Symmetry: none
Subunit: 98 residues, 2 copies
């Protein structure tokens, strides 16, 4: 529906305490100051989306094609670009990040 939404805010995780532990040297140079005790507090997560397109197409009873087109901006059909494409495999071929 809506790409780019914040997840639940967790008050501290083992990964969040690891993020501060990696960011303390870079933050210390940019702040001109030493931070005291670094303890995990509360993080959220935003997921960005894009749109990849996978098509099944009938060549005759002997052949059947898959197609793969990347799109960026909606409202322009000419922005469709072929980035992947599968062969003569049947309609039984499931379109699965091929």
């Amino acid at each position: 529906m809506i790409p780019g939404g914040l997840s639940e805010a967790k008050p501290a995780t083992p990964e969040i305490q690891e993020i501060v532990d990696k960011v303390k040297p870079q933050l210390e140079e940019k702040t001109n100051e030493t931070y005291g005790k670094l303890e995990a507090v509360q993080y959220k997560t935003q997921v960005v989306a894009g749109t990849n397109y996978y098509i099944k197409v009938r060549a005759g009873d002997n052949k059947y094609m898959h197609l793969k087109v990347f799109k960026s901006l909606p409202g322009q059909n000419e922005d469709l670009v072929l980035t992947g494409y599968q062969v003569d495999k049947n309609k039984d071929d499931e379109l699965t990040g091929f």
Copy 2:
């Protein structure tokens, strides 16, 4: 709310037939192979995801720091890049478009 996965399979939309019609010459040039008639059949859509992070973590002497870290691919410690940070402000500072 919803897991990733391909969208609904439409058995030959007017967009599906237009995508294969435009990719019929490009498929035959890239494979060097001649295909008979390509008619629309069933396509599915594909959702890519990217993950930005918004963290709070109290590293002050008496203070609280809050920073967001953008990452590309998971399983890489060098992929975790600090792009945005907050200082000595408390848990009241919400990580918002940042």
